[PDB]
Design a binder for this molecule. Structure first.
Ligand SMILES: Nc1ncnc2c1ncn2[C@@H]1O[C@H](COP(=O)(O)OP(=O)(O)O)[C@@H](O)[C@H]1O
Ligand SMILES: Nc1ncnc2c1ncn2[C@@H]1O[C@H](COP(=O)(O)OP(=O)(O)O)[C@@H](O)[C@H]1O
Ligand SMILES: Nc1ncnc2c1ncn2[C@@H]1O[C@H](COP(=O)(O)OP(=O)(O)O)[C@@H](O)[C@H]1O
Lengths: 59, 370, 370, 370
C-alpha cells in the first residue's frame, strides 16, 4: 500500500520535475538572449555617448 | 520517597511507581454487582467486584463504568476503584506517596476539585498533582514539539505544543473514542445475525474489536473488494463455541473515526480535526507541527491507522510539507510512561500540591495555581 | 587597544571591530517575550529572547523593536540588546574597548545623554563617541563632498557636505523608511486575500518586501502594463506552503518613497527633499552636490531606485548639470564601514570622550563638546 | 423608482426599501442542508433551506454561513440567500430596482467584483453600488465627523471621518466579532459541564450570549465578586427543559473584546485600537474625534459596553479631552438606516453604476470609479 503510494507520488514528482526542468532550460535560453540584448543595448549606449560628447564639443 | 502514577482513563486503570518503565497494574476500570438471586447459604457473596475480578465473574454481574466521557459520573464507584488500585493491586499505603493523577483537557472543573478532595480527605496523600494526558504523551515520545492525538476509551483530543508551550486556543476535543466504536460494532453485527445486548456481551464485542478490526487505506475500493471476494472474512470463537465470521465490519468499525457521521455525529474525522488544530496555530510553527503528529492511546492501535492518517493529512496540507505520523509500538501506555518521567524529575518536586496548601486554600487550589 | 563599532539602527544591529572590512555580527534589533502558557516542566523557560534567537522562536513570541524612529523608546530592551551584542555576539569585555555608537541627525538630546550614561555606567567602557550616520557613509564612499541620502529602517535623512564641512541648516530628516513600507505592504496585500496581522507575520512580509519589490522607472505606464498582461507576477512561498502571488504590489510598495501620500503623509518624495536640500545650499557648491548623491542604508536597495532617482532629479535640476547617483553594491553597510575607518584614524584618538571627562562633566559632556 | 438596500453582514441579512425607517426583512444569513436519511415517501423534501426556515428546522440540518469574516466564501450559498431575500422576503423583481449593497473596509477586491458581476448578470439590476458600512453608520447617526466603531458578526473596524473626509490610512480592521465570542462561550461553558458541539447548539449558545452576557466595568473586582457571592448567577432554559446556570461566564465572554488574548490573539482591545486609530490622525482633528465615538453593530449591544469603553479611552487619552461614546438605542440597524438615507438622496442618483457602464467596462468598474 505505502509502496504504491510513494511510487505514484514520486512519479508525479518526476512529472513536475520534467515541467520545472523545461522551465529551467527555457529560462536559461531567456537569460542568454537577455545577455545578448543588453549587450546590443551596451553598444547602442556606447555609440550614442560617443556621438553625444563629440557633437557637444562641436556645439 | 517514591511517588505513584495513576493514569485513570475511562476504560483502563494503569497505576505504578514513578521511575519504572511500565505500569505495574493494568486492569479494567469497572465495577460489577450481582443481578441474580444467590441460593447457596454460606458462599460468602461480596457486595461488588472491581477490576478484573469483575471480569471473570462477568456472567452473573452487571458492569458499570464510573467514567463516561473522561468525566467521573459515579464518585462512590471511583472511590472503590481507587481503593482497590492502592490496597490490592499496588499494595501500598497512600499516606506515604504523592500521587500524580491525569485528566483530559476541556472537562469540568468539579472533576479536578473532587479528585483533589477525595485524595486529600479519604486517602491522606501527602501531595498530589493533576497533569494533562497529551503533555505526558509528548514527554514519553521524547520531544518538546508536536501535535499529539490522544484517543483512549472516552475522549479524543489534540494538543499542539511548540518548544514546550501549549496553544490552548487550538486544543480540540472530540467525544467519540473506543467505546463508541464498540457500540457501533455491537449495532453493525446484528446484520449478520449476532445479537449482543448484555454488558458482558459488550466486553466480548470489545475483544472482537481489538482482535479483528483494522483501518482501510481506501474505504471505497476496500468495500468493493470485500463485496467481490471473501478473502477478508475472518472467524472468531465466542467463549462457548459458536464461531462467528465477519467481513467488511472489520474495517467499517474503525472507519467511524474518519467519518463520524456513521454514528450520527456532526463532527469531522480525526484527520480533519488534526488539520484544523494545526491551521489554528501560528503560521511559523505549523511546519514543525506537520512533522510531529504523535499518536497515543489505545484507540490509535488499529493496523493501518498511521498510513490512513498520513494519506489524509497529506491530501489536506500543502504539497511541500513533510507529514510524519509518529506511532510508537507501545503508544497505549505513553501517558503513563510520560507521567512517570515527569514525576521523577528533580525540578518537579516543587510542583506538588502539599497537604498544607490544600488545608489553606480549599479544593480550589488545584486549578487556581497548579 | 582596538575599538568597537556598534551601528545600532532601528532594524538591525551591526557590530564589529574598528579595522575590519565588514561588521562581525549582524542580527535583528528585536526582543521577544513568550505569550503562550508553557507546560513542559523543566524545559528551561527563558524570560526573553534577543537578536535572531527571537527570530527562530518567533512563532510563540511577541516581538518588539526598542527603537521606533531612530529614537530609543525602551531603555531596558536596548540594554538587553547591547548586553547581547557585547557578550554573546562579539564575545568581548566592554571594559577594554572604546565604543563608537552612531545616531541619526535631528533627534532628541536625551537620546545621546542616555546612550553615554548607559555606556559609562552599566558597561564601564574606557571611552566612547557618538557619530552621525551620513558622515560615516561619506567616509565609506571615499569622498569629502556630496549629499548623502541615508534610508534605513526608521528614518530617512539627507546631509550635504562640502570639503568636509556640513551644512546643518540644509539637513532634512524624513520619517518614512523600511518599516513604513513594510506596514504599507501588509495593508496592500489584504486586497488579494492574504492577511498578516501578527508581529511574526510582519517579519514574513518584510522578507517578501526584500525579495520581490522593485522601483518602477515610470509608475503610470508600469501600472497599465501590470494591468494589461500578467508577466510582472512573481510567487512567494510562506513557511508553511501556501504559495502567494503578488502583482503590482511589487512596485506599489516602494513607490511610497516617491509619493508619501500613499501612506497619508504630507511630505515630498525622497527625490524632492534631496533637491530641496540641495537648493538650500550656497549657489557655488550645489554643482558639486548634484554629482555626488551618495545612497546609503537598506531601504535604498530596491532594484531600479538609482535610475528613478536620477530621472526625477534630472527632471527637477537645470538641464545643464550632471546628475550622478552613486549607489555602491555594498551600500547597506556603508555606515558601519565608515565608522570603522573613522575609529581607525590616528588623528581621531583625541576625540574620544574619556571616562574621566564624563566623571567631571556629567552625561551632558557628549553634545557639549563632542 | 425606489431602490433596494441590502446590508448583508456575516450573521444577519437586513433588507428593505430606500426611504423607510427600518429594514423590512431581517433573517439569519444561513443555509441549511438535510443531514439524515428521510423515510417518509412523499414528504417533499427540499434540497436546502435558507434564512429562518433553516432555523426552525435546524434540528435535522447542518447550518453553514456563506460569509466567514466579511468575505463571501461560498458563492452558490450567497446566491441562494440573495434569491431568497429578493423573491420570498421582499417579494419584488430585481430587474426594477437599483440595489445598494454594503461591504466592510479593507477586504479583497474580488469580493466586490463578484458582487457586482452576480448582481448585473444573474439578477439584472438596473444599477447598483457598494458602500462602506462605517460611512452609512455615520449617516444614520446624524453627523459628519467622528470615529465610528462597527462591530457585527464577522469583523470589527474603525473608520475616522472629519467633515466628510475619510482618513484611509487610519482605518483599522480587526477580526474578532460576535462569532468568535460565541465560540469562546461555547468553549467556556464546558468547564461547568455543558457541551455544545453541533451547529444548532452554536445557535443556542448565540442566544444565551445575546440574553445573559454583559461587560464588566472593572474586570478584576467583578471576578472577585462573582467568586465571593453568587448573586451574578442567572439561569437559562434550553429548548428541552434542562435549565443551565452561568456565573462569571456572563462577563468573561464579552471581555474578550478588551483582551483578545483570551482567544489567543495578539491584537489589542477595541478601546486601544480606537485610541490608536485616533492617534494616527492629524493632531487638529483628534480633539473632535475624541468626542464623537459612534458605536455600531450588534456586537456593541452588550450592557455596560459604552461605560467600559469610555473608562478605558479616558484612561488612555490626555486628561483634558472630553470622551463621548455615542451609543444609540437602535445602533444594531445603523448601517441599514444610513444606507436608506444615502440611497434616498437626490444628489446620489448619479453615483449608481448603470448597467451600461458595466457593459462597457467589465466588473472592474466597481472600484475603478465608484
Ligand atoms: N489493539 C487494539 N486495537 C484496537 N483497539 C484497541 C486495542 N487495544 C485497545 N483498544 C481500545 O482502546 C480502548 C482502551 O484504550 P486506553 O488507551 O486504555 O483508554 P483509556 O486511556 O481511556 O483507558 C478500548 O476501548 C479498546 O476498544
Ligand atoms: N534587499 C533589500 N531590498 C529592499 N529593502 C531592503 C533590502 N534589505 C533591507 N531592506 C530594508 O532595509 C531595512 C533595514 O535596513 P538597515 O540599513 O539595516 O536599517 P537600520 O540602519 O535602521 O538598521 C529593513 O526594514 C528592510 O525593509
Ligand atoms: N443583544 C445583544 N447582545 C449581545 N450581542 C448581540 C446582541 N444582538 C446581537 N448580538 C451579536 O451580534 C451579532 C449579529 O450582529 P449584526 O450587526 O447583525 O452582524 P452583521 O452586521 O455581521 O450582520 C451576533 O453574532 C450576536 O452574537
Amino acid at each position: 500500500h505505502i509502496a504504491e503510494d510513494a511510487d505514484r507520488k514520486y512519479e508525479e514528482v518526476a512529472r513536475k520535475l520534467v515541467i520545472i526542468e523545461s522551465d529551467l532550460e527555457r529560462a536559461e535560453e531567456r537569460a542568454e538572449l537577455s545577455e545578448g540584448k543588453c549587450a546590443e543595448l551596451e553598444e547602442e549606449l556606447k555609440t550614442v555617448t560617443n556621438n553625444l560628447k563629440s557633437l557637444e564639443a562641436q556645439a | 520517597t517514591t511517588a505513584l502514577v495513576c493514569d485513570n482513563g475511562s476504560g483502563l486503570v494503569k497505576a505504578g511507581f514513578a521511575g519504572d518503565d511500565a505500569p505495574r497494574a493494568v486492569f479494567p476500570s469497572i465495577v460489577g454487582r450481582p443481578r441474580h438471586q444467590g441460593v447457596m447459604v454460606g458462599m460468602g457473596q461480596k457486595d461488588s467486584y472491581v477490576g478484573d475480578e469483575a471480569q471473570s465473574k462477568r456472567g452473573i454481574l452487571t458492569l458499570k463504568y464510573p467514567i463516561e466521557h473522561g468525566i467521573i459520573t459515579n464518585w462512590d464507584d471511583m472511590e472503590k476503584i481507587w481503593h482497590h488500585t492502592f490496597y490490592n493491586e499496588l499494595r501500598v499505603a497512600p499516606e506515604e506517596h504523592p500521587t500524580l493523577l491525569t485528566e483530559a483537557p476541556l472537562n469540568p472543573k468539579a472533576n479536578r476539585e473532587k479528585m483533589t478532595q477525595i485524595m486529600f480527605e479519604t486517602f491522606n496523600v501527602p501531595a498530589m498533582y493533576v497533569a494533562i494526558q497529551a503533555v505526558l504523551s509528548l514527554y514519553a515520545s521524547g520531544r518538546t514539539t508536536g501535535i499529539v492525538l490522544d484517543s483512549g476509551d472516552g475522549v479524543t483530543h489534540n494538543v499542539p505544543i511548540y518548544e514546550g508551550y501549549a496553544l490552548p486556543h487550538a486544543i480540540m476535543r472530540l467525544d467519540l473514542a473506543g467505546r463508541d466504536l464498540t457500540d457501533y460494532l455491537m449495532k453493525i453485527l446484528t446484520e449478520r445475525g449476532y445479537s449482543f445486548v448484555t454488558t458482558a456481551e459488550r466486553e466480548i464485542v470489545r475483544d472482537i474489536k481489538e482482535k479483528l478490526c483494522y483501518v482501510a487505506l481506501d474505504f471505497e475500493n476496500e468495500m468493493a473488494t470485500a463485496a467481490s471476494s471473501s478473502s477478508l472474512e475472518k472467524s472468531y470463537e465466542l467463549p462457548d463455541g459458536q464461531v462467528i465470521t465477519i467481513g467488511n465490519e472489520r474495517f467499517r468499525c474503525p472507519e467511524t473515526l474518519f467519518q463520524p457521521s456513521f454514528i450520527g455525529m456532526e463532527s469531522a474525522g480525526i484527520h480533519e480535526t488534526t488539520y484544523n488544530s494545526i491551521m489554528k496555530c501560528d503560521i511559523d510553527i505549523r511546519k514543525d507541527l506537520y512533522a510531529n503528529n504523535v499518536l497515543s492511546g489505545g484507540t490509535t492501535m488499529y493496523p493501518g491507522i498511521a498510513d490512513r492518517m498520513q494519506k489524509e493529512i497529506t491530501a489536506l496540507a500543502p504539497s511541500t510539507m513533510k507529514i510524519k505520523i509518529i506511532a510508537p509500538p507501545e503508544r497505549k501506555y505513553s501517558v503513563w510512561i510520560g507521567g512517570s518521567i515527569l514525576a521523577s524529575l528533580s525540578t518537579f518536586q516543587q510542583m506538588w500540591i502539599s497537604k498544607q496548601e490544600y488545608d489553606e486554600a480549599g479544593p480550589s487550589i488545584v486549578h487556581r495555581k497548579c
